[model samples]
Target: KELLTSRAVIKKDNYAIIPHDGLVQNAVPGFENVDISILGSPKLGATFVDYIATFHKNGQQTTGFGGDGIQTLVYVIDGRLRVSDGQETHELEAGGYAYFTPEMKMYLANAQEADTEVFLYKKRYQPLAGHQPYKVVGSIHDQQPEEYEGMTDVLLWSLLPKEFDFDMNMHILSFEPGASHAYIETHVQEHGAYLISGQGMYNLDNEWYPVEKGDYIFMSAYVPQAAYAVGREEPLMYVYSKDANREPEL
Candidate 1:
């Protein structure tokens, strides 16, 4: 409990920014050097836990169906992973993603010669009558982005349905050097963002902070947010989460 209670960042009301060095901590057993950093969770008084996992080459992890039926989304950032979903197996190279419900049995292994990094988001399964939880596996490499209106080099891709009643949505936002969002934005949905590559400057309320590959940011609902790609050559890209298809309870 102490680990969870330890504060990594002193967040303002609307947001928290955690750089790569912020909260690297031990994962559950069987994962060595496979450090995990929590961006947000119930312990932090948030609705979900955003786990960033880094696995060394040849690392392996296995887990069976259990827990409070938490649903999960896994996004591969670097290297490769052989993932078995209890039924069939899938090869998830960098830029790949897989979504699973709480009941799914899964195993992961890095069968390559380099390190593998992944982002995992866990939240309690929200059930909808006649709608069953399922699996989705795909890659960002095969996704074509739609240009953000009025922006030449900024693009967006919906990794999951924006209105599927799934309770959440994952997105890939990319920007070419010097490109940026058209305006500062705020919404009622919270966010957990993982920077996949490149560098940028992020605006949260009145503060501007430099960000780079492997950075993570957690923003509460209505936090003013925006970003600008910095440096040359590489395009800035990240996978982010937002709550969806839910209403506030009063």
Candidate 2:
């Protein structure tokens, strides 16, 4: 897929982010449009990571394996879906979303009897004993930022509660006009970032490209990236993923 803009690009597929058998690697095989920008372990001392995504059309059936170690978060960008995680089943309408841990099996279909589209962020996990499990949640509300720069409004949401989960950190990054990711940050833990709203320039694997709403970005351990928002007064929101090797797996 093309970036949100055409100004920035360093697209290359010499190095594939997902292993040959990974879901995303198989479902979306054309690397000409999708490129692996970064790969890393974990700066905060984390373990393995996996970022997977899929989209569905009206009356279309979905295909792909369910969660592994990675936590799965579903954000319905458009249409509706009938989703079942082996046990609980629910219908998610446009703008409706769901968060689920890695389960043995799950399925999603265009439940509305019409075409639908959803964004799924599956984060690979290698369980850490006593560490709180990753969570699934949603937010369209504005987060109060301590400060601001450029024309962008920003919000930072806390992920993996401190008391329960101490190994990894996940959050929602919301940005407004002129908001930029700042610089290339290389670290150890794997990164899985998904665009929820707005657009900007993303620096990954030492390259820059224009990214916008509905785009999913998977940064392997230590991949560097930054964002600079474009147009609109609404903040650019994105969900983040990081792995941890600090604690022993249960």
Highest-scoring model, lDDT? 1
Tell me the lDDT of candidate 2. 0.51
* CA shift of 30, model 2, Å: 20
lDDT of 1 by residue, 1-250 (tens): 2454422344745677677766648556545546666677665546788878877766767664223577778788887877776788889988898877667755677758678888878777666665565677889889888888667799887777654457777888989998999999888888888888899988987588888876777888888999889989688988888777767756
* Best-performing candidate as measured by TM-score: 1
Worst 10 residues of 2 by lDDT: 31-40
Give the per-residue lDDT digits (tens) of candidate 2, residues 162-194. 444444555667776776655567766555565
Clashes of each: 0, 32
Error of 2 at 195 (Å): 3.1
TM-score of each: 0.87, 0.60
